[model samples]
Target: MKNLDCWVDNEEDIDVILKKSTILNLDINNDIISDISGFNSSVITYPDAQLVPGINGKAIHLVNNESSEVIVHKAMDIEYNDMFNNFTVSFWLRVPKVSASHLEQYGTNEYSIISSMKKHSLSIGSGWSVSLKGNNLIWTLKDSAGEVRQITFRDLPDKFNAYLANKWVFITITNDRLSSANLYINGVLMGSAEITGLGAIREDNNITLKLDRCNNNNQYVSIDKFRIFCKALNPKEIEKLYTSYLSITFLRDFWGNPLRYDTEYYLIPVASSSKDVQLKNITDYMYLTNAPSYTNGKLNIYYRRLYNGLKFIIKRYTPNNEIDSFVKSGDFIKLYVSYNNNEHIVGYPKDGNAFNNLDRILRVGYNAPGIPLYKKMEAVKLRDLKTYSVQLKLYDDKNASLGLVGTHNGQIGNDPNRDILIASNWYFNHLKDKILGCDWYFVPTDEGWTND
Candidate 1:
């Protein structure tokens, strides 16, 4: 999986693969400017184009207007025989309903997926093109011998129209050195053709690649995971790629533990400027009044106050034997803190703090000083406890203390949990003259972070 020419699950993964692959790899997600590929080609997005939400993350949106287009310069300038003898272009596309007026103007060329040699004369044997004409998918290429060969899959599946109406469909086209080409839709072969005299792709200095339109006949569409492999991917490989794109999942750790949000615990000093405090139990606080209440599957933290060196304990079970579980097995948890009407997320520390010590305990099942208590049920005396429990301790110093927050309802795979958590941890050091709140919830993960 690591050695694949292109493997992208999110924007960060796209950047990773781009730096590793020596071939052309364009990630047009959320960015108007495309990454420079191995061929040194770059994309030029028109003014009307922007990035919008798509299946995985963000996709390039080409407005249905006539001026909407994404142009790739120096597209045909690849090393023909040295690096690659064949090529594959794959992407996820969504087309909106076409207007009658625009259809009448463009007609058979209503949706031009891609075209090369846009500025050069096509009649001079210097171009190739792919498009959707009515319900059919069409591809045309001119060989070095000045002969034009075309292949079209007519009357495509009825589901093809559904893709145009609102759904996204995966499309892959491969051209081999043997003069054979194949078109795949949603991982299945839709059409193929053999060119009698198809020679090496001819390069023209003035040509560029146009997407979603040829010339001025732009189509309203969104595209993502647009990749070009220097090698022709076989049917099996293409199917794998298609399935992988559609199987984007949520975040998980290396050991497959779903990130679960736990209750926000606050450790406030008894005195505003206290430098040291003695160890004490939960009741040692002079002003430890308000506590969190569980309602509607979430812990609500209202106005609360606490003293330094005293721990606040929210029992996992009540008198009625009703378990007050905040997190469960296979759940990802986050902690958030609210202060002065502004809410922030708490994060795990990398070094020097309670979070770093807590992380070490989770990884090695041992308790140490300067480490906050974070005990899984199996390791603690409360064997009936099914959720991960955490505690916060306050001390008089410039040091930081942080905790997790509730679930985030955002994009599955690209949310910035670590960044938000780190920033929230820093805010704890400056907690003065500000009211604070805390709570936690469950987060989704890839396969729920289960071993199965």
Candidate 2:
């Protein structure tokens, strides 16, 4: 009952994509093995298929794959698709440029079969593949009636020209058992087809999956975070999965405080380019004026500043020494404003019992005077009030970092050494800025490639 027509842009719901029956998940971080607990899949690789720097960690580089033909080769005739009838494959691929040959509108072996799990057949009705011709994606598969059906998705013109010219793109293809094949680029639906027949890549016993191509040396392809699900993903799920990589962020303050409604933070995602980037709000905590503002290749989350105030009343006090006179009940005092740590001092005693605050911090004292009197603290700088949202950081009394947030998960809020936050605040201010929540950078060699 999911809406197949429109794409939902929910940037605020940073929850991990509910991967239904994840069968194969090869992150390509540092290995070729699957991340799924008990998966059934294996791939063969050649020597020159270098593991280059890529988003999330390392990507399998097939820059010089014309010779080997298979930088990522032989996915164990994965007949899981034939058995389940619904399947999906997704990954991040970076290409230098489209080969001149790929620009041709029609031809056999003219396209780069980026990845596939089909058999070699003289006839058109074979298994299936994820192929690219020009800037278009062709999702081809066999139906239950033994016919080859294909739905080609034309790439976004602007993105095809710039974003995909030499950039990392998350491609997701879902085969909904013959009736259709859907294509998603960076998490949004680009195209979908409705066919007469259903059932894709009809059950094959010993076919293979390959990141193989026909003939294109201009196609230096680097792939990372590859995965396959045993079922087709809906439009919303696809967008969520894409956003997972798009908004790689954490919620916390410079002082290691959980993200407060009144604090400022940034979301820097390495998943895609700023040109194709868009933000959406699906949480109650987000509103028109409060959504994370996206710009400058990053999203800035900010809230209005609120000042801090304190009240001190001398309920009962005795002299520190003979020279110091004893204090009486119901007395009021306001200390001088030093602004050291932004401390608030309202009452000043005859003798200098100093109350101090600085530019980076604020501390206060509390005295219950024996009377009901309303007084003010002399020093004041609007201090931010604290608030919580798992959409920002999920707090749990035990094992709080167990969840993989739509962005990424970390126990920053649970760090025992809280001194980092205090020093973190001192160094960062309005005039000057520094990374507060995440100690991280998004792009690397294989990601965010430019023409220059």
TM-score of each: 0.46, 0.48
Model 2, residue 360: C-alpha shift (Å): 21
Model 2 residue runs over 4 Å out of place are: 1-17, 29-37, 64-78, 99-109, 117-125, 144-146, 159-163, 203-213, 246-452
In model 2, what is the error at residue 90, expressed in angstroms?
A: 1.3
lDDT of every predicted structure (CA atoms): 0.42, 0.40
lDDT of 1 by residue, 100-124 (tens): 3433555466456666632335456
Q: Residue-wise lDDT of candidate 2 within 1-452, one digit each (tens)? A: 54222132542342423443456666553455334424445455655666764554566666535444333332554444444266677887666534333444233443544544444456434566667666556777664356666778755444323335555667898876546678787676777766434544444443233345545454556676777765577777777776565322222221112222212223222121121111121110100112222122221111111111111122111223344222211222222222233433222112112112211111123233542211221111111211111211111223222111122112223432221100012222331222232121111122223221
Please report the TM-score between candidate 2 and the true structure: 0.48
**Alpha-carbon lDDT of model 1:** 0.42
For model 2, what is the alpha-carbon lDDT of residue 319? 20
